[PDB]
Symmetry: D2
Subunit: 380 residues, 4 copies
């Protein structure tokens, strides 16, 4: 019955993640001035360049140079020696108005609850009782390891740390009547960018003692746990230098780390009419409500939409055999407790609030301060 599972996470300096964070900084800037801004901001990062491309219709007046550069500064790129500098990089902007064909078809002249989905697509929600955050342990640990790196970097506990990082966590699992039971951490891989003025031995020791031991519960670590710390050796240069990144290229990392399923839509740079984000958030909220409500131990939720149509086209519940209720009974409960129109989801989850930059690293799910992470008390 046993298996290994591995999830990845990347730090704020990974070029794909730079792009997600910039995209969401641009979104939040619009939303601070215009709660109804329509935003579809894609970011591209490569040697010496950030480019913004997409569609925005907004009453806000946003200084894109400042927003981009300040976000790059926040990430921690302020020098050639690091591979990238917010002060001297190229910032190119190709942002236009949202197509009138789209605007007319989705949101123009409609009451808020009746706003059409901004696009077709499918979205999944997932939850699992194996952690208190109702997330897979592999992806929880991978994200927490990258967050701890950035925390220690920014407060000066390990001042040699730089922004680019990647972590991979392999956990050995047992199964229990469709639930999954994590038993031990099999392997932890951590690669992190660093200043020239530190040796590998010191870094590797710090990674084990100040990062891994601070984050991973001791019960899961044992004599046979494999540690690959700076496995490729030195990593002085990182970020976009000799690399290319794009918004929405870490969607598995952003969600459940390979668990459950994904509908393919990216989250970052998109306002709530883009169901790729708002309905995946709501479906997470549904999944977590079902598990915390004690209706199942593990659950996958699918929803889908058509451009310009307010209501979901389909809703599906898969409980992995972990409920006394049938999947049809759970679906009926979901339909009685949730209204998954984007114009209702927006009110329920407060999705005009400019909190999206916070979502763009360390996973969109599993943190308690977001409204989709507060379970709904269900009536049935």
């Amino acid at each position: 019955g046993t298996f290994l599972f591995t999830s990845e996470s990347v730090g704020e300096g990974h070029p794909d993640k730079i792009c997600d964070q910039i995209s969401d900084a641009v979104l939040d800037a619009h939303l601070q001035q215009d709660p109804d801004a329509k935003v579809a901001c894609e970011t591209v990062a490569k040697t010496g360049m950030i480019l913004l491309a997409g569609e925005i219709t907004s009453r806000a007046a946003v200084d894109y140079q400042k927003v981009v550069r300040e976000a790059v500064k926040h990430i921690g790129y302020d020098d050639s020696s690091k591979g990238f500098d917010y002060k001297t990089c190229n910032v190119l902007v190709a942002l236009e108005q949202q197509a009138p064909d789209i605007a007319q078809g989705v949101h123009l002249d409609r009451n808020e609850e009746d706003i059409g989905a901004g696009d077709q697509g499918l979205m999944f929600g997932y939850a699992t009782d194996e952690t208190e955050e109702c997330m897979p342990l592999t992806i929880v640990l991978a994200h927490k390891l990258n967050a701890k790196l950035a925390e220690l970097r920014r407060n000066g506990t390990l001042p040699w740390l730089r922004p680019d990082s990647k972590t991979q966590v392999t956990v050995q699992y047992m199964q229990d009547r469709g639930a999954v039971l994590p038993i031990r951490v099999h392997t932890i891989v951590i690669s992190v960018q660093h200043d020239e003025e530190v040796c590998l031995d010191e870094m590797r020791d710090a990674l084990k003692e100040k990062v891994i031991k601070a984050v991973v519960p001791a019960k899961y670590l044992d004599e046979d746990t494999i540690y690959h710390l700076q496995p490729s050796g030195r990593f002085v240069i990182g970020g976009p230098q000799g690399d290319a990144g794009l918004t929405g290229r870490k969607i598995i990392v952003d969600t459940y780390g390979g668990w459950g399923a994904h509908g393919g839509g990216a989250f970052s740079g998109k306002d709530y009419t883009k169901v790729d984000r708002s309905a995946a958030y709501a479906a997470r909220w549904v999944a977590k409500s079902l598990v915390k409500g004690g209706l199942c131990r593990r659950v996958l939720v699918q929803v889908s939409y058509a451009i310009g149509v307010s209501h979901p086209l389909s809703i599906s519940i898969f409980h992995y055999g972990t409920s006394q209720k049938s999947e049809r009974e759970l679906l009926e409960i979901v339909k009685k407790n949730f209204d998954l129109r984007p114009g209702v989801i927006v009110r329920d989850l407060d999705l005009k609030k400019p909190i999206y930059q916070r979502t763009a690293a360390y996973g969109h799910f599993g943190r308690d301060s977001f409204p989709w992470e507060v379970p709904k008390k269900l009536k049935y």
Copy 2:
């Protein structure tokens, strides 16, 4: 016992898919001249612009003006009236190409990344793929065919489809009963009327693609649901490489452990090993060992052979998951270098993978089952 499941696909002129096709055209162009080229090509598309970005190690000299413009012409974007024109678009090249290692070039006498790849196969179609995503793909292909042959000359290249199937289950296998809902949105000229479009989409597209047994009086049609789709392509929506990874794979079914395919050469194990894991899954189903199967392959830093393989048959096999694993190990060598030899992955066939799905197609080595010995 019944449930719904939904998958989508997009056309060749969807802006994200334009980028996947260009990224793979770039890969193919390199491989044609240098079979050992290393390519990590990202494409970005917005109004008027094709931007290429990324890292290449290669001996090839590629004419990007030609490669990009021919791809765009082939997709069908050849006039400003359509929103994009291969003749007049801006091709920006930001690719960083270097020569291969000098010392090894003169060495005339001749993978480590912790993660997992998933393969999936189901007997519900002959493609060994979910019906939802098979139909979604074929609906886009049909639109391109009818556009290109002049049957529906009001069609433009950008299209999206979505199919919801009502299924029942039988001992872990999934049995399609009927198509519940079809969405089609396709870019169009300024003369055709909405009634005429909706009729053609049902009668000449959907009914030519979906087996009649799956269509009934209750099937729901959302055809041109936005009302007007004249602006399309990159003009309407920015595109990037690797933003249709679920379209490229299994449509929400099975699992995905991360990574996009297009614009990456065969040494990127998250492409090559995903193709191998598909090959294994399809071999098990076509071999009659499983009706449905998820093949999960983990690789470790410092091991070439997989760290571990798990086979999840959903209860559709008489044999245990452990017995199937033993059959897999005796019949497949999933070291990444062996994969690339067995599936002939140095050949420039990647552009063809970049629309209508990487899986389920009638034309790639990973879609040819291996005859298993056991």
Copy 3:
């Protein structure tokens, strides 16, 4: 004593001129909302692309996509068949704030009259009594031929005309005690973009009869005047297609067509603190005031500046031998009648007004509606 002289002019669709006009559309957009905007907007045009690059510090909120596209539409590029389309071209924007080192050094915390020159440089003014506009006849005729093409194109008199054009006018001159006397037009070259649906014979006839005869005084045209009309044959595609243009690459065309001298500075995209524009305008005003005042028949004026310094570093007057007064006497007259500080020039010539897009084709000099073309009555 005789010589030939040739000047060129280009139409609004010439790729360099597209860039000047866009640069000045961006300037005027800023100035409409913020009269004190600092603008240094360079434009680049090539196949399917307009890029803006430079420095702007302004209270205005400017929609660069709309400003660029509307200017391209105004020029007349709205279809692939023409080589360029405002609807579907790429517009990239790389506009940042003016460097604080520059701002502090030039204009910050200073009274308006004491504002420092925005840069060092040298500038020339020129005037000549050979036309009523006080301009060389070669450049007057070259500009007027391109203007007449755009006029007839836009009002539908010759609907096959497209925006790209180039004209070259060779005039035979005599000299008269340092003045120049135009005698005859030696050669007129006109190339103009056109729709596919017209033949060369019809175009050539129209160019002679509706353009050249409407614009060039009959006295200068004779039996030996050489006409090269569509000399390279068909010209269906023009503008940025397979070409590249930049702001400030037509500075000779913009000024005196090869006559007098040039200090090297471009005009378009620059607010009045950039002496490259404001002091060249003032020096034109000085030159024209001297000629119309009857102090000389032909005159060249030089001025120069240092970054951050309000006053000119040098002023020089060269009268070609066409005055009874010495060059030193004329200089003394100029210094008594003009204050060539940029902060004074701005008030005299009304240079915060958003009229700059009008300057960007058909020459900055010679038109009566601009304040630098109204002679100052001189006291001496």
Copy 4:
């Protein structure tokens, strides 16, 4: 009888001059592999960005990453602290290159543009150039020399200079009396103080460059007149090719009929014929025929020989303007193809022309006088 005249020059790291040097580096790279390459390369520079745009017909395969980055490194922009770094800048390539004509490539057995070009020469310096622009150039060169040898290591690459000379005239010749005003603005580090900079600029730069006879107690110095120039290069001011055409030529003296030089091959007659007209003017002065001279050469559509040549000697010749014209016609063939052979203009020497002036330099064929027969 005295007057002032002012000319300027800029350093290698002035952003417009960066672009001229890159455009000509691109030209040279093409010519090194293909002497018949046609090049019209525009460079744009702004914070973090080198953009190449333009049309090329050539058989060469050029590594733009290398050509651009090496040029920037050579100029001295190698760290973010200086505002620009060759290591980390974005190189965007939008050049459109095509192969030469297929039919003529197989033709194995082997200019029309109405306009004028001006040449100018003056005996006031040995360079045969105005003192104003000679001094302005040399002041920038001195700054680069002292920066590069570590004498003044607080110097950065971006610099501008301007020199105003008080002249008298003698029968049309111009005689420099004294330097009236010097401006120097040069980018600098964050540690050096303004007093120290101003002293070094006067004592180690100006006094090492300007002949002492021209400096006096009344010479006006504007050294670092802005007060602070730490931000510089493309970060501070966008650069473009062909925006220093007066710096490249005669500094306001003589005349200019239009056109920039850099990034254009020898078949662009407004480069080649401008060089020839300089050659003619310098030959007349060095031959003792003129002290000062403006050579005006007109070309006509459909004539290879110039349509007309006028020689304006300002009264500095015993011979009439007509007699000088006859000497020019007997000694020079100004057909553009003959020019390119005589001045050896297919050689890749253009990058060297792109800073410190095209005229007056000790190293180009157009600056070597022709011995005249008359």
